[PDB]
């Protein structure tokens with residue numbers, strides 16, 4: 429359907445818009461290129477491992493690789509809906525968001541290829557709770573926006589994508605990676621990538637907070653909606669976290685070898701702390 | 714609707730895919746930031762001009778500013794459709810395409826603001842032919858892809874966007890800018906931006922060629938469709954070019970002042986040469 433006019437011909441960009449400022453920061457802090465990461469030491473580390481130790485790291489990489497790919501495809505409807513509402517500054521920022529996610533997909537796929545498991549199908553480490561979030565609830569909530577861009581729909585979309593998938597699972601995943609392999613001195617390439625990813629992610633979560641708050645600010649009843657949608661998803665979050673935990677406890681050999689006391693109680697409490705923390709970044713009033 | 718699996722969990726990125734290679738080049742050659750361009754000399758140039766000379770440059774800037782904004786919003790459906798067909802490498806590349814266009818919007822809006830015409834509504838320089846292409850035919854052809862992603866639809870979308878708007882109008886616009894203000898020694902900032910834009914644009918046109926050719930390669934009858942859609946739009950292309958030409962001929966004062974012999978016959982023939990050239994980049998066989 430037609431354009432009825434253009435903001436940068438009638439006027440200019442709104443230079444003070446928060447999403448314009450986030451867009452500017454994204455350009456400044458988003459220069460990194462996964463193609464420049466040296467994975468040669470990672471390949472050696474990985475080949476040095478025994479079959480049992482090799483397996484230990486694959487579940488987390490499988491969750492991240494699919495997750496990056498899901499959110500690369502699934503952010504498009506949000507960019508469309510805000511574009512249709514004429515929110516030009518949001519759209520400019522969302523171009524950096526999508527390009528960040530493309531690079532994240534690229535990074536993990538390069539690591540898989542370099543250590544020699546590209547040919548392996550890592551879908552085996554996706555349980556029913558993971559599928560419910562990433563194969564189903566995420567794409568349902570985003571695609572909805574094509575036909576329903578009400579405040580309710582936009583809140584639910586940002587909640588699932590930015591507050592749960594990024595704000596709870598991704599963040600806890602980054603913490604988990606450092607706690608385990610950074611201590612072990614393993615996989616320097618991959619951890620360089622995790623550091624870059626974790627930096628991009630801060631802007632992604634800030635877009636979600638901004639999006640949810642600006643809708644809550646019009647009607648403080650949407651706040652209840654936010655909390656409700658957070659709680660609906662919690663069972664699948666913790667059901668994926670318990671499942672990974674259980675794989676971790678059964679496959680002890682990497683941890684013994686590298687003298688890592690892998691505190692799964694602490695990882696679990698970090699996930700719980702992330703979830704409650706995101707809730708607190710939205711003010712009812 | 715659900716994801717039924719993920720390519721970078723089952724396998725890897727297709728590293729040899731042409732769109733993966735274009736994506737890599739885009740990251741390498743796409744570091745430029747419109748926020749780093751120094752427009753201070755442009756502001757002085759523009760204030761130095763008389764009212765008559767000031768006006769001379771505004772029509773081309775109005776066409777570009779709206780055009781950048783249209784294609785930023787209107788590329789989203791192409792990214793969606795190729796994503797739904799599972800063409801991951803195309804999508805990765807299209808994230809760079811969208812981000813390039815965001816920066817193009819940004820660049821012209823910064824120039825308008827810096828020279829002191831942000832508050833002016835430049836819609837006056839969009840005639841009926843321009844509106845037909847940018848306010849109507851472009852968004853119709855792209856949005857169609859949400860409900861119709863047939864080869865016919867995808868060809869028509871790439872033809873209008875990449876071969877006509879970018880491959881014919883944008884390219885001729887870049888040539889026109891250099892021919893006029895680069896000679897005059899005017900607007901150094903803006904011409905730095907035009908150089909960066911013209912570089913990005915090469916990748917954008919290459920995506921269109923690739924997209925159209927890969928569909929022609931399955932069925933050489935789609936070739937006729939391509940040519941037909943090119944010809945349907947030509948009248949509006951030349952009707953916008955004649956209209957700009959006529960504004961240019963009526964408002965002679967910038968050209969006299971700077972000893973520019975502005976050959977509108979040559980600019981017209983460059984537009985015609987662009988259009989025929991794009992046709993030739995698609996092989997029937």
Ligand SMILES: CCCCCCCCCCCCCCCC(=O)O
Nearest residue numbers: 491492495496594597598600601695
């Ligand atoms: C043993 C403690 C378990 C910790 C939880 C691990 C979470 C795995 C993360 C998989 C999803 C990644 C989401 C990426 C989203 C994005 O790129 O914005």
Ligand SMILES: CCCCCCCCCCCCCCCC(=O)O
Nearest residue numbers: 776777780781879882883885886980
């Ligand atoms: C006097 C000769 C006239 C020459 C033709 C001028 C064309 C003006 C261009 C306006 C549309 C710009 C399209 C931008 C598309 C993109 O950024 O990919």
Ligand SMILES: [Fe+3]
Nearest residue numbers: 529594629632
């Ligand atoms: Fe993210």
Ligand SMILES: [Fe+3]
Nearest residue numbers: 556557667668
């Ligand atoms: Fe369960």
Ligand SMILES: [Fe+3]
Nearest residue numbers: 814879914917
């Ligand atoms: Fe372009």
Ligand SMILES: [Fe+3]
Nearest residue numbers: 841842952953
């Ligand atoms: Fe006419």
Ligand SMILES: [Mn+3]
Nearest residue numbers: 496528529532
């Ligand atoms: Mn990511």
Ligand SMILES: [Mn+3]
Nearest residue numbers: 781813814817
């Ligand atoms: Mn452009």
